Nucleic acid binder design. Sequence first.
RNA 1: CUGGCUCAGCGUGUGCCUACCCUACGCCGGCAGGCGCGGGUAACCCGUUGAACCCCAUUCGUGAUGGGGAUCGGGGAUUGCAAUUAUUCCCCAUGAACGAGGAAUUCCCAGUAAGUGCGGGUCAUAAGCUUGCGUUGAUUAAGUCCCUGCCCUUUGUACACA
Lengths: 141, 115, 144, 55, 100, 191, 75
Amino acid sequence: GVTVKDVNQQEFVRALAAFLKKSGKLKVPEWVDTVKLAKHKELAPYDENWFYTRAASTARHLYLRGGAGVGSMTKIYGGRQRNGVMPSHFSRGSKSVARRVLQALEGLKMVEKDQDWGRKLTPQGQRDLDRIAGQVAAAKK
Amino acid sequence: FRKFTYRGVDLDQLLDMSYEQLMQLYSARQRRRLSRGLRRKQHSLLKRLRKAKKEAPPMEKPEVVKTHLRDMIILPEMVGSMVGVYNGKTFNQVEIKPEMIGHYLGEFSITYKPV
Amino acid sequence: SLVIPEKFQHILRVLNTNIDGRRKIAFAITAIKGVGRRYAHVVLRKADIDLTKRAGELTEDEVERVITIMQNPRQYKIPDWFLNRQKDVKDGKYSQVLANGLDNKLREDLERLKKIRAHRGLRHFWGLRVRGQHTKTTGRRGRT
Amino acid sequence: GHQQLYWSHPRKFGQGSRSCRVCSNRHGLIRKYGLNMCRQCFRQYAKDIGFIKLD
Amino acid sequence: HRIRITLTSRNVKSLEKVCADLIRGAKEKNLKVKGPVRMPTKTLRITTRKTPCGEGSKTWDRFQMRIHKRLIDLHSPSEIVKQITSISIEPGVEVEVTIA
Amino acid sequence: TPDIKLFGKWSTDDVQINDISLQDYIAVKEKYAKYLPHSAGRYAAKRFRKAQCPIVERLTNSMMMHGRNNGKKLMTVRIVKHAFEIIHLLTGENPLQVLVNAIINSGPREDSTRIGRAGTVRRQAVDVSPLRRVNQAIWLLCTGAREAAFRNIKTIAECLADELINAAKGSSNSYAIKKKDELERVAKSNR
Amino acid sequence: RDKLNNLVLFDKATYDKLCKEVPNYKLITPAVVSERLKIRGSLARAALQELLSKGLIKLVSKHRAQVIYTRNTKG
RNA sequence: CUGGCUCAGCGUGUGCCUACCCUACGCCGGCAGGCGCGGGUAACCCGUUGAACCCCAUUCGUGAUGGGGAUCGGGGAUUGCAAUUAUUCCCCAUGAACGAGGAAUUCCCAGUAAGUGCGGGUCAUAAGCUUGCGUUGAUUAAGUCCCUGCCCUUUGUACACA
């Protein structure tokens, strides 16, 4: 068999975001169609279902490197704030988007409010992560 | 030509006021300015300004109140009055029409010159 | 599907705006003074329009429904923070302004500061930079 | 009131708050490692403090 | 019994003299001793302008001050190595002893 | 493959430099035939070590210029890979021989310079060495691709593929061959 | 001076020119077809994806920067 | 442009007077922040410093254009005793000259130029500066006195404050 690390992560996250959308019951907030993902970003995401992608992205980030709280999610989801006429600077992600994704995965049986802060990946989470890994690798076969 | 109104609220409503509503009404710079606390430390100055204003004569254009202060946000309780704003050199004898609300008293002066 | 369909509108005229039909809708409706990239994208997400179309492939019913959402901000759940005109100092109504309306708002406002004779208005009138910008070595193209 | 006026303007920050611990002027100070020294006084006294020119 | 002595000095070979002295002490008094753990050195770096005034060509001084740290652990009661640690105190090296 | 090393998907065997002058200072066959252009470096240390650097790595190195494209050898190698696909399709035969022929035909062999009797000065024509032939050929076809691609939909990988096909035939269309013949004209003008 | 007025959507006779001229081009890219037919690169790509999917052009190897096709092999 | 993926090295950190530290984690908020309880005077905690460029895939199509972000209106947050002459930061809005730059002219040859971001100093607020650190990584040269400087030897001198 295969695990999460044995397949191309570019196909994995789209497969898992689709897998969560086939459930289609992810406690998605209200202001999804009006919000900008970071105050370094300019426009709203091109795609309309960016929440399910980010939920699956956060999910596999907790899988690979667990014990990660909202502040490390704003760190990992950072880029350039090109300051117009002044030079560019590193800037963080929106705290609200990261927190609500983890609270969505907390309400669902995937992550858990972990001791030493942050969220772990629970055995049901890891199972669903490892099984779809096998499905994506068997698809790329 | 029609009698003007502040944000969306009549001047009579703004003149019959308790501070924490006008704190909500005007803009955020003036909000923290008055939320920052009492006026009996540095702004013992502004209670003198208040004392100077509410000691007005009979129905005439009240005596000009000179001030060594520029940073005063004009609330409705000091409007229709005359003031000497110290510019370093000149005490600017300016009159306070009711379009001065949420503006600085010191924002009514020029020092320099064009060519 | 990819052929220029029957009655494809090359030129549109809405709120006295020349929107070209060949533009993509989110950057097509962005043409008028008051509608930028962000406000164009949120209101075309509001109106149940596929943003993958050109600005001529749509029907006049889809035109009026995107025009209504445009002029109806809070009426379709666009929040207080997004609006380009929040808490007007005369009206006190939080709602977006468009081309000819905003021309009236800005002109009245800087002429209001001029007539109360607040420095911002005095710097506006004497024709200098308003926001404490150093003019000792900048602003020469506009001033000969 | 003289105890209202005299030394009354608050100085909890700015270069008005701090002075060179030797000569007592407020231009080009070193605050790293609690030095609190003007660059001229430090650069003079550096090798008693234990600083070396090696690089 | 886990007593820990942290030797800290600006001079390395004076630090190594005191360090090599305390191990000789622990071994000749028949005591379990974890060898000196060389903790990373810290470089107190200050870069100044060279001129007191302004009108010289732009030249900078680069003052450095290296600070070195060993720590040696011992499994023994307090008062034996107290007599050892009291022996061979140099002007340069700085000693701090904790018990648990 | 303990047999022979393709350049991604391009064959190195049966690729001969017909010109004997650019045989010694062109390194493509048998030993310098590698999978990638992108290697370590250590050619710039000494003088003639530049000669042995794989000619495809020399093309890559020269292709990136004008500030924005500085230290982007990963972007530059992907453009050369894509161009190598396009010159294979448009032409049919080996992309390595296309590049080799373009470089041989783009290399000048006489060019002017200011000479002695230093009393005043004089512009006399001289011969360029086989290394200088390579250097100027690769530079001129790289600036040929750059100047052609700048503000035109025809993408840079396709622009290089045009310039390589043109020069390899000995077109007179290619920027590299125009400039070469201009240098050899000015050489004839003052010899 | 010059201005390049490319189409945003297909004409009937330009669609004829595409589906008949393009399957004999030995090099078919969105840049080549946009130059020859006068179309925007978005439509040029959209047509190339439509023609590959319908099964006429032969794809070689695509990329986020460069998407390259060619003619279908006859013999 | 929007997503996704994936890699660093130098540092500094609770103040003498000195007030003033770096911050994980959690809930509220779109954002700037706010409110909670902890760690660390440090190879111990921030922290395995999940940096940018870059890399994989959508959107755009040669249009002063989804290039450019000056100038400007309004609102929103934070520091301070106080931001008007906008301190700093956020959001919607506004969409300027600029199509690679004449005379001239600066710096530089290998982990160098250049791109790219990250710390220190200033610091209540705090980088278009400087001072350090990695990251990606070339074209050209192994030469000459032509230009510009400087230093020699021969030579002439009525100059030696030359």
